[PDB]
Amino acid sequence: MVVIRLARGGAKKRPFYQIVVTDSRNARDGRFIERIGFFNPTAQGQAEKLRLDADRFAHWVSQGAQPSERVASLAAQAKKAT
Amino acid sequence: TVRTLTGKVVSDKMDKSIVVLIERRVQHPLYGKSIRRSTKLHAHDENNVAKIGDVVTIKESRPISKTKAWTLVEVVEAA
Amino acid sequence: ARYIGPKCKLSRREGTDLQLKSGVKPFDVKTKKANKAPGQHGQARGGKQSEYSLQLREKQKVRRIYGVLERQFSNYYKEAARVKGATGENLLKLLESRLDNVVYRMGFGSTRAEARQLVSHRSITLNGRRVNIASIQVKAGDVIAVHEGAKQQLRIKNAIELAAQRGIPAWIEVDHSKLEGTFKAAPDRSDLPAEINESLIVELYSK
Amino acid sequence: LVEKLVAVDRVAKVVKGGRIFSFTALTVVGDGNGRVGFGRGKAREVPAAISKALEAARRNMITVDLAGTTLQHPVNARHGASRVYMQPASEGTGVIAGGAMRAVLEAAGVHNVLAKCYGSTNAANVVNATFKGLRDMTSPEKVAAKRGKSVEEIQ
Amino acid sequence: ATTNQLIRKGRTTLVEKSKVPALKACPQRRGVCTRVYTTTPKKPNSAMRKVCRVRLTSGFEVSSYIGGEGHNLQEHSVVLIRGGRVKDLPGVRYHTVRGSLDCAGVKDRNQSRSKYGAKRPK
Amino acid sequence: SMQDTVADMLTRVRNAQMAKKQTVSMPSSKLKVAIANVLQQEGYISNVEVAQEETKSTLTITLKYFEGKPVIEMVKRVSRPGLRQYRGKDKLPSVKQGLGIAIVSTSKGIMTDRAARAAGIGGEVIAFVS
RNA sequence: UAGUUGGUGGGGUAAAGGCCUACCAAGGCGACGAUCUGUAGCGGGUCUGAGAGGAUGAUCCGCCACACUGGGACUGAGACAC
């Protein structure tokens, strides 16, 4: 099915995740349909920690995408922050 | 909103089918001189209205046989 | 790597004083051999040179005064060429913006080698943290200070005493009581000595 | 006046009993701000050859009008089998040219230029070609005067 | 050429050939010493050059120069050869690496030891 | 045979300038008349005349000299029957940094490259004049 | 090049179609290179070059093909299945 999950980027021991909408059968860092934000667990200074596009998130959820656990938690965090 | 082509019939021997020659003029990728390129398309003629030498128009469609995917729309000029 | 060994022979070969010595005694009395090259075939400055020789000798002088090796120097030249402006101007600003050079011109070091030793041993703090890399670029507005453990050090006292005799730069605002200074802007070409001819280095690397 | 020695060569003449050797020198002189010339000298030793070359160069002079410290427009020139191309450059470029072109350009006072030689790189012919190109390069005021228009009209 | 002639027939580029075909685009090769002998140079040089005939893993049969003063090579030795021409021994296009497999590094040298494969004296 | 009348016109003008004639005449056509009008407007020639004595028409051009040298020092055909050259508005060539002119045929008529760039259109590059 | 090119009736497929079959016709492709033969996974890209071009297709991403060598099908939404 269609899922919303994190794709790992960055360097060794300093991960940086892209929040993507993709078919679940694809590889973690491979083919995807749409990128809708990012997550940086180790941000500091002027670096942004989390960015999510709520409109496209809701659109894909309505179409039937299934958010993962961490993405659901991040969406709750972003909604609280906004 | 359909793809149409205009050409000249070069054969009508086969049953319900015409061969139309399309001509286009393009620039040579390296030397820049305009050169003539041609292709042959098999089209579909239900009533054999087309003849050799006429200028016709065809449109794209679903396949009708092994090599035919175009259908005649109108005969602009008759030979 | 880093050059270690005889210092005065470099000045004798270059033909001028590159101030690797502290400066308590003049270069001429210190060497007794200036105006002659340090080889067994040492000669005077009146010998003929080629354009390639002039270009090479010009760049070597800057490298020896600033203590920079060839790979880092080529990287510096590439950066200066990429950045807008005059290439030699940018290169000189980049060389002057180094942390160890700033310490030397701020007076806590008698020589750039002493300043580099202090920076490496973490006796100097940038902003509010103990760095140990001498190639760090100091930016406008930065605050340089001596670690409280490194204070009341005889070499630092002697260094500031010699710096007082030396000319204080215009772009550095330094108080010697608490041993702290502020950088404000990159020195300009007129501020820098006119002996150095950056055009030769630019021609060399442009080849 | 800046004086530059482009090339010095030794030449031979055959006589009965052996050979007579001589020297030829080519020089370029220039004020550095729009006046330049070149010359050749022949003598049985180098100092005399050089002096004769400089004398001929100082006799053979022209005036060239630069645009600031660079050329006015791209130039193609040739003398014999040597061809030269020169092009204006922005400030900070320098003189990107071989030795023979560099002598003439620096003597004339150009500071930023890109140049290239095609064909034979014989020094005398290269210097000749660069000389003719610089001599024949034109200027907006001359173009406007010859056309009867104004400089702003020409653009 | 006319632009029409260029359209009809293009411009042809001739393919270059390697100067060291026995290497088969490898940096070095192994071989067995078929022969070890001495040859005379071309004019106007005069000496006794040390050469060896080697059968390579590539399958070819070549001749290689033995550099330096004095060598231990004999028949049936296994050696490593690289490119490099001698320019006065006709038909010799390869060099032998001193100190690699059975070749030994030359003795009594203290300048340019990395070539000739002599270890640093203690 | 004769297959490029524009090149013929340019060659006649160039040879007349090299031989120091005062006028040059040729058989006429509307394309050559347009090119001559552009040259006269740009100031390379003095006067353009067309004499229609019968079905045949003759074009006459008056040449200009300045300081003992011809005003037109270079004229070059660019597009030719064996290789036609077309350019967009962003690729119109500049002749010696704008001190010369390039003649361009556009859908709005024959004009200079400066005028074509001002109007934001392209076309066929006929000749370079300087 | 003779299921070869087109047509009709029938079969077959999730689906158009000589995909298959029985008849009818003599068509179809080719100097704008058919057929035959040698070499080769293709692209985003990488290196070089002032540019135009030249060389290349490791590591990352997309598509295709293969699973000791050849021929098949079954189960299943999906395979002719490391």
Place this chain on the structure above:
RNA sequence: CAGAAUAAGCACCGGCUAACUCUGUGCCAGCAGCCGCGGUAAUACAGAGGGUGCGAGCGUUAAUCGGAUUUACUGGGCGUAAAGCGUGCGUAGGCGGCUUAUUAAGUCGGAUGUGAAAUCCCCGAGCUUAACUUGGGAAUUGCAUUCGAUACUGGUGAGCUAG
């Protein structure tokens, strides 16, 4: 916390190309990218002193592009240097005189859709700096559809005589 305590090599010095002298040997031993050195005072062979260039690296070999306008589209040639078929006629093809009307294929302009991400470039951010990671742009010079222009080339109709 203790103490300078644990830590520097490789190539080269005749010209191209920055950096020279002495011993040893004598067309031998040898060196060599090219030009070339060695046959008794070798700045070119071997060692030593001195020096130069790089530096945890330094040299050699292999391979691609460049220099090479040395396949030349940008951008070359054919009297004697390599290069005009022995000479005609002619098929496919390429190119083609002047005036006028029409068409809008070539040509040109606008709009829309598309040209995945990463990579290259720019302004920032985070790594003690840098490599590296990363936000947002610019670019992707292309392709397709549709709406316009008519100077030139092409098509069609009519007309003309300098070929």
